[PDB]
Amino acid sequence: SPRPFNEIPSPGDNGWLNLYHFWRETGTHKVHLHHVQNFQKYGPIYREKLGNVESVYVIDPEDVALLFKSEGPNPERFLIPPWVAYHQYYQRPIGVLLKKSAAWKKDRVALNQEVMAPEATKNFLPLLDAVSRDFVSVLHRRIKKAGSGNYSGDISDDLFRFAFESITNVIFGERQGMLEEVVNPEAQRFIDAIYQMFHTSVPMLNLPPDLFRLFRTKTWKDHVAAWDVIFSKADIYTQNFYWELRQKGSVHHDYRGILYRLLGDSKMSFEDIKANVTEMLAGGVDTTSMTLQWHLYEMARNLKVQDMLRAEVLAARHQAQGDMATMLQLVPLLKASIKETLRLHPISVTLQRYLVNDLVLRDYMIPAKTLVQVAIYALGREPTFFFDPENFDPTRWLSKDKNITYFRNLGFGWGVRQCLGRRIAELEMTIFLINMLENFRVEIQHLSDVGTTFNLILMPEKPISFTFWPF
Amino acid sequence: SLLDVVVENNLDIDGFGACEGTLACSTCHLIFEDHIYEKLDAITDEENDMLDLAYGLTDRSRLGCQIC
Numbered sequence A: 001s002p003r004p005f006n007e008i009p010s011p012g013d014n015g016w017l018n019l020y021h022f023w024r025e026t027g028t029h030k031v032h033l034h035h036v037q038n039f040q041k042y043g044p045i046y047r048e049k050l051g052n053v054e055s056v057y058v059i060d061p062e063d064v065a066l067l068f069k070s071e072g073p074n075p076e077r078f079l080i081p082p083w084v085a086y087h088q089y090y091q092r093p094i095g096v097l098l099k100k101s102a103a104w105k106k107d108r109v110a111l112n113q114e115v116m117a118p119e120a121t122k123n124f125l126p127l128l129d130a131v132s133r134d135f136v137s138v139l140h141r142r143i144k145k146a147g148s149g150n151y152s153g154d155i156s157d158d159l160f161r162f163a164f165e166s167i168t169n170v171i172f173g174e175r176q177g178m179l180e181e182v183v184n185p186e187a188q189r190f191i192d193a194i195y196q197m198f199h200t201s202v203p204m205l206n207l208p209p210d211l212f213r214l215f216r217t218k219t220w221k222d223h224v225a226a227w228d229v230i231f232s233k234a235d236i237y238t239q240n241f242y243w244e245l246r247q248k249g250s251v252h253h254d255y256r257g258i259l260y261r262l263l264g265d266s267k268m269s270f271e272d273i274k275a276n277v278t279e280m281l282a283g284g285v286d287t288t289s290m291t292l293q294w295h296l297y298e299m300a301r302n303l304k305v306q307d308m309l310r311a312e313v314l315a316a317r318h319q320a321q322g323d324m325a326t327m328l329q330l331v332p333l334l335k336a337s338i339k340e341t342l343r344l345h346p347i348s349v350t351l352q353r354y355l356v357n358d359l360v361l362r363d364y365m366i367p368a369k370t371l372v373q374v375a376i377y378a379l380g381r382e383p384t385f386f387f388d389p390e391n392f393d394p395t396r397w398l399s400k401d402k403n404i405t406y407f408r409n410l411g412f413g414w415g416v417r418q419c420l421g422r423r424i425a426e427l428e429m430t431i432f433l434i435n436m437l438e439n440f441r442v443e444i445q446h447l448s449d450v451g452t453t454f455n456l457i458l459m460p461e462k463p464i465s466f467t468f469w470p471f
Numbered sequence B: 001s002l003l004d005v006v007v008e009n010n011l012d013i014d015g016f017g018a019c020e021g022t023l024a025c026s027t028c029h030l031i032f033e034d035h036i037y038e039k040l041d042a043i044t045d046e047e048n049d050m051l052d053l054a055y056g057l058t059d060r061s062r063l064g065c066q067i068c
């Protein structure tokens, strides 16, 4: 008695017509709003073919749970078509992001041992702390320079350089110098290419490669140029590290970074390692930086919450007697505030899985091989799933009612193919915010609501200018 | 760990311990009886997060790959 697939509410079966109306009414850079509006229009489940790709969209955590309950051993998400086309056409070695089945599993398991396992990740603490402490020093320097007892500015560019320094430090065990007054321009080029690769992805999204070649010729060209900078720089770093290792040929007892571990004790070939280094580097720069910027924004918008997080951090530093490793298990509210930041400001608009087997959702039969998307952004703003969703309230994640948070913490995805950088990102952000909260109060002058723009990853729609006061 | 037991003992459960003991899935999910539960060290924030997204949750359950 479950309804057939075609009875799922839908704007219609013409993908090109659907694409036309999406661009006309909402716009490519507002796909998150498109999702919100569609659930308002159709209810909690709908299907929409956009251009060539059809998906079923869900918002209800109970449906999300069923989706992930039926997951197979080698899950597949939606592959970004211009990314795939660039790698295939220009014959670039692929990493874990673009692989599937057994070849994906092979990379993933090798990578998990160096970047996910608690026994590997404990080594990240000193490397990430060093970078965050240097960030703090930059701000103290700018405050001194300003002569006003404070510093006001848009720090988005500093945050990109912070994220780059952090990911490179854990990968290479070496400082790139991106937080110094005089910066490596070739590393800045790498940073800028990552943003450009994301931004240029958007006009090609719902199109097959045959069409974006023909109607998005300039964008495709710019996109190819962004990825070329990414691969070229990453490959130089990796090759140089490989040869330096042989030049200094000493068996080190001290931790030397992820790459050292992979090259010395991995089942991965050098080519797989170099491909995955490229992805980790590119994945690390725009994700934590934007998420941290939103966190700072929410702290400035919610001064009482900022006070409570500071009070928690100071007590944890005291109780841990200064030790970072101990401290990180004593900041439950800070960690909750990160979940809360990702609820309202997800990096990823959706999660997606291709079904392995037929599946029923809300009395509708969804056939195997169908793409199903969980609308993460829409979920986070939905008042039936979160009390007062517009309010930044970290304590909602500590609720002893363990049905208030059921399948709600979805920012990094789920299961065996969840975010590969999740531990790096969680540790980088928590350590960053500990250092910031100990050192400054954050405010925004003339605070106004900052919206969101879809630039492949979700990002603030306009610049945010903070005021920092030393604490 | 209880994962390494299932691995080299060669038990049944399909896809149990999919991430292979890196606290990066929740397929090693197991239910413990009261007297064994309190005997084990405090639960990390990371394990708690994985547990909230594990289907069929119990207040006496833990991740198999994190139990020595």
Ligand code: HEM
Residues within 6 Å of the ligand: A077, A096, A097, A098, A108, A279, A280, A281, A283, A284, A285, A287, A288, A291, A342, A346, A347, A348, A351, A352, A410, A411, A412, A413, A414, A415, A417, A418, A419, A420, A421, A422, A424, A425
């Ligand atoms: C705020 C920080 C971040 C957020 C919110 C985020 C979010 C995500 C999401 C939602 C996914 C898809 C997961 C799924 O399908 O279940 C993902 C996958 C991925 N992430 Fe992240 N991410 C972040 C940081 C990073 C960092 C720092 C890296 C660099 C190591 C990274 C590398 C990757 C890679 C390589 C994948 C694909 C993994 C695979 O297919 O096996 N991410 N991330």
Ligand SMILES: CC(C)CCC[C@@H](C)[C@H]1CC[C@H]2[C@@H]3CC=C4C[C@@H](O)CC[C@]4(C)[C@H]3CC[C@]12C
Residues within 6 Å of the ligand: A077, A078, A079, A080, A097, A278, A279, A280, A282, A283, A287, A347, A348, A349, A350, A351, A352, A456, A457
């Ligand atoms: C730069 C590469 C190597 C790493 C990027 C990691 C993150 C940022 C990537 C990996 C998988 C990605 C998602 C893959 C699928 C979709 C569905 C699409 O309709 C909107 C974008 C979205 C939601 C992507 C957002 C960015 C994403 C989460």
Ligand code: FES
Residues within 6 Å of the ligand: B003, B016, B017, B018, B019, B020, B021, B022, B023, B024, B025, B026, B027, B028, B029, B063, B064, B065, B066
């Ligand atoms: S096996 Fe992946 S969490 Fe225990």
